[PDB]
Amino acid sequence: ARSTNTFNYATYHTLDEIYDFMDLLVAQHPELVSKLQIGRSYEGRPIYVLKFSTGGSNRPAIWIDLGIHSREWITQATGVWFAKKFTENYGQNPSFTAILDSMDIFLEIVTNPNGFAFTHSENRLWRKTRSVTSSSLCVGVDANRNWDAGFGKAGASSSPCSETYHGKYANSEVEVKSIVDFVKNHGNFKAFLSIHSYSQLLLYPYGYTTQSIPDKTELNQVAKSAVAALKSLYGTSYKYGSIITTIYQASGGSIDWSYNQGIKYSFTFELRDTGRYGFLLPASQIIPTAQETWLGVLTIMEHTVNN
Numbered sequence: 001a002r003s004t005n006t007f008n009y010a011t012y013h014t015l016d017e018i019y020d021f022m023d024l025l026v027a028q029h030p031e032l033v034s035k036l037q038i039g040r041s042y043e044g045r046p047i048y049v050l051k052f053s054t055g056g057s058n059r060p061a062i063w064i065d066l067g068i069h070s071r072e073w074i075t076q077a078t079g080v081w082f083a084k085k086f087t088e089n090y091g092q093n094p095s096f097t098a099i100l101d102s103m104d105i106f107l108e109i110v111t112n113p114n115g116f117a118f119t120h121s122e123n124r125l126w127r128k129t130r131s132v133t134s135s136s137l138c139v140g141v142d143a144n145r146n147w148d149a150g151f152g153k154a155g156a157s158s159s160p161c162s163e164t165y166h167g168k169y170a171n172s173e174v175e176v177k178s179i180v181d182f183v184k185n186h187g188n189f190k191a192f193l194s195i196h197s198y199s200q201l202l203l204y205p206y207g208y209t210t211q212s213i214p215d216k217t218e219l220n221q222v223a224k225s226a227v228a229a230l231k232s233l234y235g236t237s238y239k240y241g242s243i244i245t246t247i248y249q250a251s252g253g254s255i256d257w258s259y260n261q262g263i264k265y266s267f268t269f270e271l272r273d274t275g276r277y278g279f280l281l282p283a284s285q286i287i288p289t290a291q292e293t294w295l296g297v298l299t300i301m302e303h304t305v306n307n
C-alpha cells in the first residue's frame with residue numbers, strides 16, 4: 001500500500017487499514033468513488049458507505065453490505081476486493097460498464113465497526129454490536145435480528161446474553177437504523193445484497209415465515225443463475241432457497257425488511273466454507289472466494305438492470 005495497487009488483498013486487515021484503504025481508493029478514483037458517512041456506531045466510530053457512480057441524479061441503485069456480523073472475516077476482505085474490482089473493471093468490462101453507466105452501487109464494507117474492532121483486540125468470534133443494555137450487563141445485539149420484519153418473533157432470542165438477541169425494539173441499533181434511514185431517504189434502490197458467512201448458500205425471503213413471497217419464481221430463477229455463474233470459476237457448490245427453508249428460521253433479518261420495502265432483488269449470500277474452517281477461513285481463500293462471489297453478484301446486478 002501507498003496505493004491500492006500495492007495493497008495486499010490476500011490478507012485480513014484491521015479496521016484502520018480498511019478505512020485507510022477507502023481513502024486511498026477515493027483519492028485514486030475521485031470521479032468514480034466517494035466516501036459517505038451515514039452514521040456513527042454505538043462506541044462512536046464513523047460508519048462509511050462508498051458510492052460508485054458515473055453521474056446522474058437519483059439513479060437506481062444497488063446496496064451491498066458486508067460484515068454486519070463481525071467475526072465473519074471473509075466478508076470484509078471480500079468487500080475490500082470488490083471495491084478495488086469496481087475501479088478496475090469499469091471501462092474494461094462491458095456488462096459492468098453498462099451497469100455503472102445507468103446505476104449507482106452502494107458498498108458498505110464494515111457494517112458493524114465496533115464488533116469488528118472487538119474481534120481484533122479481544123474476541124475473534126464476537127458476532128453482535130457492542131451496545132450496552134442498561135437493563136442488563138450482557139453487551140450487544142444481533143444486528144441481523146433487529147430489522148423491522150417479523151421483529152421479535154420466533155427465530156431470534158429475547159435474552160440479552162444470547163448472540164441472537166433481537167434488541168429492545170426494531171432499529172434500536174444505530175448501525176441498523178443508519179442504513180434504514182439512508183435507504184428510505186434515497187427512495188430508489190432496486191437491489192439489496194447482504195453478505196455473510198459461512199455455508200455456501202444464496203438466500204432470499206422469508207426467514208420468519210414459511211409463506212412464499214409473491215415473486216418466488218423470479219428470485220428463484222435469478223438465484224439459480226447466480227449460483228451457476230459462481231460455480232463456473234472453481235466449482236464451488238452453493239445451495240439456494242428462502243431463508244427459513246435453506247439455513248433456518250430467523251426473524252428481523254435485513255433482506256426480509258428490504259423486500260418488504262419494495263426492493264424486489266433482496267438476497268443474502270453465505271460465503272465459504274461449509275464448516276471445515278467456518279469463521280476462521282484461511283487467508284489463502286480470500287481471493288478465490290472474492291473472485292467467484294463477484295460472478296454471482298454481477299449476475300444479479302445484470303438482471304436488476306434489465307428487469
Ligand SMILES: C[C@H](NC(=O)OCc1ccccc1)C(=O)NCP(=O)(O)O[C@@H](Cc1ccccc1)C(=O)O
Binds near residue numbers: 069163197253
Ligand atoms: C448465529 C449462527 N451461529 C452459529 O454458530 O452458526 C453455525 C452455523 C454455521 C453454518 C451453518 C449453520 C450453523 C451464525 O453465526 N450463523 C451464520 P450467519 O450470520 O451467516 O446466518 C445468517 C442467516 C440469515 C440470513 C439472512 C436473514 C436471516 C438470517 C444469520 O443468522 O443472520
Ligand SMILES: [Zn+2]
Binds near residue numbers: 069072144196197
Ligand atoms: Zn452472519
